[PDB]
Write a protein that binds this ligand. Structure first.
Ligand code: HEM
Ligand code: HEM
Ligand SMILES: [Ca+2]
Ligand SMILES: [Fe+3]
Length: 742
């Protein structure tokens, strides 16, 4: 390893420690997740439900879209109410009304606060302590609780069915007129909802807080943040402040920046291999998927202000066939697909360059096979989502060929397996080009080794999404799912981008070999240190114990080291005085990387940390601030990276076509202005108002229909269309430039 032995050892130690921590917390989730009770029995002896009924309700929830229609335990969509919190509040209000009648003969509202406190204390004792699971695995609830459940059932039956008395409510929730047509399936789904509400309001066996760390905020049962929550939030802010102070104090020593002399030629000296020439279809697929995804996002926003549609007398009803759940699922899946496609194309273009400008036998055939597999995956998953949400798909094939119901993993298990096979094919095609480069003499191989390791990580770490099943517990499913939406996208993709950037810069002669290798190794070590144990900030209130708040909060704060220095080195080199001898013509792909740094600083650093401490997330999980952070971080870092990658690939495929700077300036600035406007004028104010309402009254109230249909919040969502149109125009401009080039 030569002079990089210390960096390699530090990376190894960081990897070992961080995966040991993450794996230990994984085994804790299997043993400490909220159990499914064997029986839920009334105090008189009548069984309400059983474990099989709860699991059947979970499967029924998966056939409606799951997280893509409302929210369960804080994860999902944001137009329909959070179901666990809404059910808890309605059952607590019904219990209070019933108990006030048998004690004072009046309702809860018309009773003096002195006895309201007594009623609230009796509710808190009954719900948090008397509902604890027993030795035999059963839960005993009172007849008053049974009556409250029976009283609140008809509202949910009308909401998830087609009752005329609840038509307006269904429209405000962006829900089709029959989300779950089967009454028997609706009854099971309400059992599942009750189970989630029970797990969110019942103390742990040997603790004074619930299985969800007192989530959601519910003043009626005193579901408030715990001392551990406060203690670890304070610790995480203190760690972030130290880290920032230490990075300021040591930036001078840490970064030496031994710059090299700028060359004159273009080592652009790339006789293109047949496999490289077959990536124009990849570039076109990336930009077409980007345009389709942006259009699907515009179509989902329209459902949040109208509910069913406008005009289209065209002869069918559109929410019956392409409802909000379907449009949002496709919108989320297309974004994942096109960002991943851009990264995979970029890698496939660099592989033959690593191989010395030659194709290993059958590389073009492998590339074409991968293209066909990616097309089949996308088309089949979308068709399965359509047929599952229309309920034409029989329910026993839903989890495998329809809608999984889990966000960011909505595609069926069969399509997930096909995508995994395609990713392994891509890794094989990348790795077969490295054998000759490794089998050389004299040349240092540390940068190649770190690049190959980042190849293996991207091509491998989609597997943890197959470690749960249809009937797997929700907390296990959430753990394995964030192993993919956070560790594989947020992590292992920055590593790939960094290792490709270093490889390209070294082979263009912009940086020294030692500088590139050391920078890549250090960046990989800091990204793994801040990202691998930072997975747990998605599991603070998902049935995990209190150790998740601690780990996720403290290490996620450690992910401040890269974000800051990011791009300083660009402003250190932005002022060039026509130093771009052969780079000002390609100014656009190289400027997608300055907006990348800006959005990494803003969307991922500012908006990502205001939601990170558990004391904040306790109130703002499930609100529009999550949408703000998601849009900013995801497109501003990774969509721009992928767009720059496919623009740079298209530049080398067709070096005789110039870039039309007037269409490029328009597209770039329309994208950046549209993103800025959609957060700053619509998304952020809605999130702030929702956060205030949540903190003051309850997450139930911040997600309620009565609160979302306020005059200020409907005009705040309509105004978004102005920035949405600008963003769609910018996306269309970029996609035309790319199509014109290839
Ligand atoms: C015209 C531009 C866009 C519009 C109008 C738009 C609109 C929307 C809407 C309406 C939602 C659903 C919020 C809800 O639950 O009610 C959403 C969610 C989302 N959008 Fe977009 N979007 C746009 C562009 C993008 C882009 C470019 C990306 C990234 C490639 C993206 C990624 C996402 C993600 C990841 C979510 C889910 C976020 C979450 O659940 O927190 N969007 N968007
Ligand atoms: C570019 C890097 C990042 C990307 C692409 C990214 C992406 C996302 C996305 C799409 C979500 C949506 C969650 C959902 O739909 O359920 C999310 C949630 C979250 N992210 Fe990030 N993120 C990034 C960096 C960060 C950083 C640096 C932090 C911490 C400082 C962070 C903390 C969170 C938290 C706490 C949530 C949960 C919000 C909620 O569940 O309601 N993220 N992230
Ligand atoms: Ca979400
Ligand atoms: Fe995350």
């Amino acid at each position: 390893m030569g002079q990089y032995k210390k960096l390699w050892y530090l990376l190894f130690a960081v990897l070992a420690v961080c995966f040991t921590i993450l794996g230990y917390m994984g085994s804790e989730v299997y043993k400490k997740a909220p159990p499914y009770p064997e029986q839920v029995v009334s105090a008189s002896g009548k069984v309400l439900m059983a474990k099989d009924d709860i699991l059947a309700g979970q499967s029924a929830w998966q056939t409606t879209g799951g997280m893509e229609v409302g929210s369960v335990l804080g994860h999902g969509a944001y137009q329909a109410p959070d179901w666990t919190a809404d059910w808890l509040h309605r059952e607590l209000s019904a219990w209070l009304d019933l108990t006030a009648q048998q004690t004072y003969g009046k309702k809860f509202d018309e009773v003096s606060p002195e006895e309201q406190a007594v009623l609230k204390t009796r509710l808190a004792d009954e719900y948090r302590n008397q509902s604890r699971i027993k030795e035999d695995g059963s839960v005993v609830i009172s007849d008053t609780r049974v009556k409250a459940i029976e009283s609140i059932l008809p509202y949910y039956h009308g909401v998830y069915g087609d009752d005329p008395a609840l038509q307006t409510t269904r429209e405000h929730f962006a829900m089709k007129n029959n989300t779950l047509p089967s009454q028997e399936a609706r009854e099971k789904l309400f059992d599942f909802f009750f189970w989630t509400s029970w797990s969110a309001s019942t103390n742990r066996p040997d603790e004074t807080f619930t299985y969800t760390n007192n989530w959601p905020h519910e003043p009626l049962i005193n579901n408030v943040p715990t001392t551990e929550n406060y203690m670890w939030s304070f610790t995480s802010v203190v760690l972030l402040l130290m880290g920032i102070g230490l990075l300021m104090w040591g930036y001078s020593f840490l970064t030496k920046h031994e710059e090299v002399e700028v060359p004159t030629e273009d080592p652009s000296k790339v006789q293109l291999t047949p496999s490289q020439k077959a990536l124009g279809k990849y570039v076109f697929l990336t930009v077409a998927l980007f345009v389709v995804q942006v259009l699907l996002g515009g179509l989902t926003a329209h459902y949040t202000v109208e509910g069913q549609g406008f005009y289209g007398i065209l002869g069918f009803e559109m929410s019956d066939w392409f409802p909000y759940a379907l449009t949002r699922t496709w919108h989320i899946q297309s974004a994942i697909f096109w960002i991943a496609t851009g990264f995979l194309t970029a890698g496939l273009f660099l592989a033959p360059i690593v191989n010395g400008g030659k194709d290993p036998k059958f590389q073009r055939a492998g590339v074409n096979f991968l293209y066909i597999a990616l097309f089949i995956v996308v088309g089949g998953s979308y068709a399965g989502n359509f047929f599952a949400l229309t309920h034409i798909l029989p329910p026993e094939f839903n989890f495998w060929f329809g809608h999984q119901g889990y966000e960011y993993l909505d595609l069926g298990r069969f399509w997930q397996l096909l995508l995994m096979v395609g990713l392994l094919l891509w890794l094989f095609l990348m790795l077969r080009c490295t054998v000759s480069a490794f089998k050389e003499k004299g040349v240092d191989k540390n940068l190649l080794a770190i690049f190959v390791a980042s190849m293996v990580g991207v091509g491998v770490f989609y597997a943890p999404g197959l470690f749960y099943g249809e009937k797997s517990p929700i907390a296990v499913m959430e753990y394995w799912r964030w192993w993919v939406v956070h560790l594989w996208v947020e992590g292992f993709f920055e590593v790939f981008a960094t290792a490709a950037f270093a490889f390209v810069f070294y082979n263009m002669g912009f940086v020294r070999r030692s500088t590139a290798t050391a920078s890549t190794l250090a960046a990989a070590a800091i990204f793994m240190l801040g990202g691998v144990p930072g997975t747990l900030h998605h599991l603070y209130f998902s049935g995990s114990t209190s150790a998740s708040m601690a780990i996720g909060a403290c290490f996620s704060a450690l992910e401040v080291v890269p974000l800051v220095l990011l791009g300083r080195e660009a402003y250190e080199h932005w002022s060039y005085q026509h130093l771009s001898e052969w780079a000002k013509r390609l100014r656009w792909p190289l400027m997608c990387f300055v907006a990348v740094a800006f959005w990494n600083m803003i969307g991922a650093g500012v908006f990502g940390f205001l939601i990170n401490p558990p004391i904040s997330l306790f109130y703002i999980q499930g609100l529009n601030t999550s949408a703000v952070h998601a849009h900013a971080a995801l497109f501003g870092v990774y969509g721009f990276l992928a767009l720059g990658f496919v623009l740079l690939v298209a530049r080398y495929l067709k070096p005789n076509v110039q870039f039309d700077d007037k269409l490029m300036t328009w597209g770039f600035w329309l994208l950046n202005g549209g993103l800025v406007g959609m957060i700053a004028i619509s998304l952020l104010p809605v999130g702030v108002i929702q956060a205030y309402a949540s903190i003051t009254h309850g997450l139930w109230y911040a997600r309620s229909e009565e609160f979302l249909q306020m005059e200020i919040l409907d005009t705040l969502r309509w105004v978004r269309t102005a920035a949405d149109l600008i963003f769609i125009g910018g996306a269309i401009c970029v996609a035309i430039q790319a199509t014109k080039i290839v």
